[PDB]
Design a protein around this motif. Sequence first.
Motif, PDB file in Angstrom:
ATOM      1  N   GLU A  99       5.497 -14.479 -16.484  1.00  0.00           N
ATOM      2  CA  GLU A  99       6.846 -14.057 -15.983  1.00  0.00           C
ATOM      3  C   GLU A  99       6.756 -12.676 -15.559  1.00  0.00           C
ATOM      4  N   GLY A 100       6.148 -11.822 -16.593  1.00  0.00           N
ATOM      5  CA  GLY A 100       5.934 -10.266 -16.261  1.00  0.00           C
ATOM      6  C   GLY A 100       6.578  -9.662 -17.396  1.00  0.00           C
ATOM      7  N   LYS A 101       6.531 -10.438 -18.882  1.00  0.00           N
ATOM      8  CA  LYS A 101       7.171  -9.724 -19.875  1.00  0.00           C
ATOM      9  C   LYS A 101       5.583  -9.346 -20.507  1.00  0.00           C
ATOM     10  N   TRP A 102       5.683  -8.056 -21.183  1.00  0.00           N
ATOM     11  CA  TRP A 102       4.650  -7.419 -21.711  1.00  0.00           C
ATOM     12  C   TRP A 102       4.650  -7.924 -23.252  1.00  0.00           C
ATOM     13  N   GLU A 103       4.009  -8.944 -23.535  1.00  0.00           N
ATOM     14  CA  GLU A 103       3.779  -9.472 -24.921  1.00  0.00           C
ATOM     15  C   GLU A 103       2.482  -8.805 -25.607  1.00  0.00           C
ATOM     16  N   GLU A 135       0.728  -1.164  -0.107  1.00  0.00           N
ATOM     17  CA  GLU A 135      -0.147   0.180  -0.195  1.00  0.00           C
ATOM     18  C   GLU A 135       0.874   1.259   0.153  1.00  0.00           C
ATOM     19  N   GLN A 136       2.046   1.251   0.777  1.00  0.00           N
ATOM     20  CA  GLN A 136       2.973   2.190   0.811  1.00  0.00           C
ATOM     21  C   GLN A 136       4.136   1.832   0.452  1.00  0.00           C
ATOM     22  N   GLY A 137       4.762   1.990  -0.773  1.00  0.00           N
ATOM     23  CA  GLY A 137       6.012   1.275  -1.262  1.00  0.00           C
ATOM     24  C   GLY A 137       6.717   1.901  -2.404  1.00  0.00           C
ATOM     25  N   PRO A 138       7.768   1.692  -2.830  1.00  0.00           N
ATOM     26  CA  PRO A 138       8.480   2.193  -3.947  1.00  0.00           C
ATOM     27  C   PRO A 138       7.814   1.585  -5.282  1.00  0.00           C
ATOM     28  N   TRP A 139       7.831   2.495  -6.200  1.00  0.00           N
ATOM     29  CA  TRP A 139       7.337   2.118  -7.564  1.00  0.00           C
ATOM     30  C   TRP A 139       8.322   1.502  -8.609  1.00  0.00           C
ATOM     31  N   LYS A 140       7.956   0.281  -9.056  1.00  0.00           N
ATOM     32  CA  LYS A 140       8.797  -0.407 -10.029  1.00  0.00           C
ATOM     33  C   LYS A 140       8.807  -0.022 -11.292  1.00  0.00           C
ATOM     34  N   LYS A 141       9.636   0.760 -11.760  1.00  0.00           N
ATOM     35  CA  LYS A 141       9.776   1.337 -13.333  1.00  0.00           C
ATOM     36  C   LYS A 141      10.109   0.137 -14.404  1.00  0.00           C
ATOM     37  N   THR A 142       9.119  -0.193 -15.120  1.00  0.00           N
ATOM     38  CA  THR A 142       9.658  -1.330 -16.100  1.00  0.00           C
ATOM     39  C   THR A 142       8.883  -0.689 -17.766  1.00  0.00           C
ATOM     40  N   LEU A 143       9.795  -0.898 -18.615  1.00  0.00           N
ATOM     41  CA  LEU A 143       9.236  -0.713 -19.987  1.00  0.00           C
ATOM     42  C   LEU A 143       8.341  -1.578 -20.537  1.00  0.00           C
ATOM     43  N   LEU A 144       7.614  -1.276 -21.588  1.00  0.00           N
ATOM     44  CA  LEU A 144       6.680  -1.870 -22.500  1.00  0.00           C
ATOM     45  C   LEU A 144       7.375  -2.759 -23.582  1.00  0.00           C
ATOM     46  N   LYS A 145       8.431  -1.843 -24.152  1.00  0.00           N
ATOM     47  CA  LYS A 145       9.034  -2.310 -25.268  1.00  0.00           C
ATOM     48  C   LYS A 145      10.418  -2.213 -25.160  1.00  0.00           C
ATOM     49  N   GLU A 146      11.165  -3.204 -25.553  1.00  0.00           N
ATOM     50  CA  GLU A 146      12.550  -2.937 -25.765  1.00  0.00           C
ATOM     51  C   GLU A 146      12.886  -1.871 -26.735  1.00  0.00           C
ATOM     52  N   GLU A 147      12.293  -1.797 -28.118  1.00  0.00           N
ATOM     53  CA  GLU A 147      12.438  -0.775 -29.087  1.00  0.00           C
ATOM     54  C   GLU A 147      11.674   0.438 -28.561  1.00  0.00           C
ATOM     55  N   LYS A 148      11.408   1.460 -29.474  1.00  0.00           N
ATOM     56  CA  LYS A 148      10.890   2.519 -29.372  1.00  0.00           C
ATOM     57  C   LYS A 148       9.494   2.477 -30.439  1.00  0.00           C
ATOM     58  N   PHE A 149       8.382   3.382 -29.909  1.00  0.00           N
ATOM     59  CA  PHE A 149       7.206   3.254 -30.640  1.00  0.00           C
ATOM     60  C   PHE A 149       7.349   4.269 -31.909  1.00  0.00           C
ATOM     61  N   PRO A 150       6.736   3.853 -33.042  1.00  0.00           N
ATOM     62  CA  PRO A 150       7.018   4.662 -34.301  1.00  0.00           C
ATOM     63  C   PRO A 150       6.728   6.289 -34.161  1.00  0.00           C
ATOM     64  N   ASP A 151       5.780   6.522 -33.284  1.00  0.00           N
ATOM     65  CA  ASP A 151       5.313   8.029 -33.135  1.00  0.00           C
ATOM     66  C   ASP A 151       4.743   8.149 -31.910  1.00  0.00           C
ATOM     67  N   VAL A 152       4.480   9.532 -31.713  1.00  0.00           N
ATOM     68  CA  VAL A 152       3.948   9.966 -30.286  1.00  0.00           C
ATOM     69  C   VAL A 152       2.719   9.136 -29.518  1.00  0.00           C
ATOM     70  N   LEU A 153       2.954   9.085 -28.340  1.00  0.00           N
ATOM     71  CA  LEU A 153       1.938   8.157 -27.880  1.00  0.00           C
ATOM     72  C   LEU A 153       1.194   9.085 -27.099  1.00  0.00           C
ATOM     73  N   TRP A 154      -0.174   9.027 -27.283  1.00  0.00           N
ATOM     74  CA  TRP A 154      -1.230   9.930 -26.996  1.00  0.00           C
ATOM     75  C   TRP A 154      -1.963   9.470 -25.718  1.00  0.00           C
ATOM     76  N   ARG A 155      -2.519   8.157 -25.667  1.00  0.00           N
ATOM     77  CA  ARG A 155      -3.655   7.756 -24.842  1.00  0.00           C
ATOM     78  C   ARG A 155      -3.098   6.550 -24.021  1.00  0.00           C
ATOM     79  N   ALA A 156      -3.535   6.073 -22.886  1.00  0.00           N
ATOM     80  CA  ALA A 156      -3.493   4.784 -22.276  1.00  0.00           C
ATOM     81  C   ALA A 156      -4.667   4.557 -21.679  1.00  0.00           C
ATOM     82  N   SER A 157      -5.361   3.441 -21.793  1.00  0.00           N
ATOM     83  CA  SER A 157      -6.601   3.109 -21.479  1.00  0.00           C
ATOM     84  C   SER A 157      -6.719   1.668 -20.903  1.00  0.00           C
ATOM     85  N   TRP A 158      -6.778   1.454 -19.734  1.00  0.00           N
ATOM     86  CA  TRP A 158      -6.576   0.057 -18.953  1.00  0.00           C
ATOM     87  C   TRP A 158      -7.893  -0.591 -19.277  1.00  0.00           C
ATOM     88  N   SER A 159      -7.926  -2.074 -19.239  1.00  0.00           N
ATOM     89  CA  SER A 159      -9.049  -2.741 -19.536  1.00  0.00           C
ATOM     90  C   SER A 159      -9.819  -2.878 -17.987  1.00  0.00           C
TER      91      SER A 159
END
Lengths: 131, 150, 286, 136, 109
Positions: free
Chosen positions: C275-279, C228-252
């Motif tokens: 495992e935790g790999k964002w396929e 509930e009160q802890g550090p935030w684990k920063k992790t990427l979504l892609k090893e590469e970079k996205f083609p253009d600017v990312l506008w939105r993020a909408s969780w299911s």
Amino acid sequence: IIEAYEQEDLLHLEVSDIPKFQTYIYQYSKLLFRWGLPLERVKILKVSTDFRSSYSSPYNGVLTHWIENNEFGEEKFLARNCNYCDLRVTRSSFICGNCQHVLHSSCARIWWEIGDECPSGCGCNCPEMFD
Amino acid sequence: DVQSAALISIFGSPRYFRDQRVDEWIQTYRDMLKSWELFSMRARFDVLRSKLSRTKTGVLTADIKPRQIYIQCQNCKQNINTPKYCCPHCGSSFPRCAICLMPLGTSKLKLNEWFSFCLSCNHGMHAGHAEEWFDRHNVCPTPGCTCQCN
Amino acid sequence: VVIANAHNELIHDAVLDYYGKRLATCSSDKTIKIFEVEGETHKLIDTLTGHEGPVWRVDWAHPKFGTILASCSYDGKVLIWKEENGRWSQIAVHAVHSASVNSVQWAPHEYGPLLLVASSDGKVSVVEFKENGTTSPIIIDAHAIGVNSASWAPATIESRKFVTGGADNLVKIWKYNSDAQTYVLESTLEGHSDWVRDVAWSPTVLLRSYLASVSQDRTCIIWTQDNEQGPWKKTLLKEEKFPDVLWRASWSLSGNVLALSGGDNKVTLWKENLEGKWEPAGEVHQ
Amino acid sequence: TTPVPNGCGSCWTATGELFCFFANKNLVISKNFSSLLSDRKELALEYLFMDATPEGFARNNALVAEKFDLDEISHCWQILSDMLIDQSDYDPYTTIWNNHPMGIKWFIKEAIVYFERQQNLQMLAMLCCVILSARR
Amino acid sequence: VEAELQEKIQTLVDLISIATHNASVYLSIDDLTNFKIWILIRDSLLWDLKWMTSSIADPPWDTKKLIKQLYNQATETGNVVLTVNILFLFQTIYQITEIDIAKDAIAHF
Ligand SMILES: [Zn+2]
Ligand SMILES: [Zn+2]
Ligand SMILES: [Zn+2]
Ligand SMILES: [Zn+2]
Ligand SMILES: [Zn+2]
Ligand SMILES: [Zn+2]
Ligand SMILES: [Zn+2]
């Protein structure tokens, strides 16, 4: 054997056994309300609240208050009586606002399919004056 | 035959002349209709008595039941409606339905228009919601009440 | 459900209601349109015109509070629309910021009818819409140069937090303090080299609290928290970079599936493995 | 410091339909993505957890998960149904075996862990409400 | 290699039959606490049979894990007959414990 005889429950569950029942049940109740199932969320929250009261206000405020009428004879008994069946009303009533008369839920759902005024005959159009 | 005497004497007695025999016939026929469990006919007889007791001015001369119950709010301890979704005297929030989470509205009768308030646990649901819930259940839907309202 | 040329010029948001039965599409034409999306039919209802500028975001309120739709636009005016007896109408005006209001989002219904109004001048405001006696919106300077997004944390039980994405390479988590009667800073998250465009909290919390911050450096960070009160684990979504600017993020709404929205007009779906790999889990284009 | 205006986005719904809008006129389309979501509306319309026996809830849920092609969920409900079998006569050894930590409670704990890793909130809360409704 | 698969399927089938007989003979003398155990074992064997016919930690309804956990509950409670029955029937196919512990349990029985 004596302790099993002294236990009316099938299981002796504890909060240590199910640590996160409240959050999971509440979130699934929210998901159930997002669907067209508004009774299942009430069932699951009733189960969760029953267990929470077992190991230990959006529906408050309004209390129904009888009119304390200074009476002597039978109208003391007739004050707390339904206006359709003349039986004592104690659960699941219907109250009008313009006229202060009770009805049972079954008596109200029977009478308003065929009637238009108060069954006590006070002249109050209760479908249009119960607010 | 007290039935014919009642149905004839209700046309003109309490509108014009107070006599004890008509009251006896009316009470006897109402008790007979309650005895045969003809509550609908008793209610129609009562509303017909109220319709036929109106004078030329319009004043109802029939004897009606006194006022029985009224709704408080326990925040200003007053009536919530005068003979909006908030109390008209202190602004406190009205309780919501336990099913659809919709509040009480204060300002031909559809079922989904009035709360069916229990007089034991003081928890209110819409009548359609109460019929849909209490058909397959027998406990108050609010979180922490054990009261079989149906 | 295919809708063609809903608006004459451009489109900025299309938010479904709580029941998935009404869709509120806003655009740069100063217009908000309501569609009945029952089945495959997409019959239009109304053509709401109140804003003097391009409309950025809309957000339906809970049916607990009725059919209420908020709106934010370039003019700094937050307009709120209520449908009574089938007649859509504006109710209240919230014009408190000196610049364009960027993000609008209702609070979870346990907190009451609270609106998260975030503007491009680095100021955020949480305003309550109760009856005729409206409350004073509490204003705190969230970021230095600008705020482009602000989203709420879900009430898993019966304190209040919301994520705030700035324009100065930062993501800030705010916590309500009862002593100060305002929102104090809880944690500061730095993982971007450009303006943070959208921040989104996961509505479901199973063993972790997920976030999804996107920015203009073509990257996505999924900030997770175990306790509930802890550090935030920063992790990427892609090893590469996205083609253009990312506008939105909408969780299911259930199950941590993320729907990104890049500048290439292409919606990318991401689902985590065991495992935790964002396929990747899908793709919607045009 | 207003950002560059966006042209595309998404909005999820409770049944897994992804409503995406696009720019070049403007186009709004909906794509079904219910297979990526573990929690399903079809099971909630058929699950029962109050109006039967404690074994009856789990057997009904096993039948429901069997007719919807969910093998692991059906086997979990079947195993819980076997573990919640009672009878009219009362013997104490059933209660002693029920209250043991290595039976029932261990299964529920490990199933909660497994469905936490599978991100199945529906099965988590259904396991909780069945194991609490079986308590009586 | 198909002969090994057919032998495994036949072993699962008549082990299901043995489990059903053990459940029935427990139900004859009316002790439900071990009838439930053998019903659990029978359904686990049926699950294994259906996945052999159809062909991070293990789920609790996995056959080896559930049989080992029922074995551990039996040997902690004191049910000698049930743990010894599981040691005859499900030792070679499901490696429950070491061979020394299993043989010592059979010798003590
Ligand atoms: Zn009655
Ligand atoms: Zn009346
Ligand atoms: Zn009335
Ligand atoms: Zn009041
Ligand atoms: Zn209701
Ligand atoms: Zn109650
Ligand atoms: Zn009650």
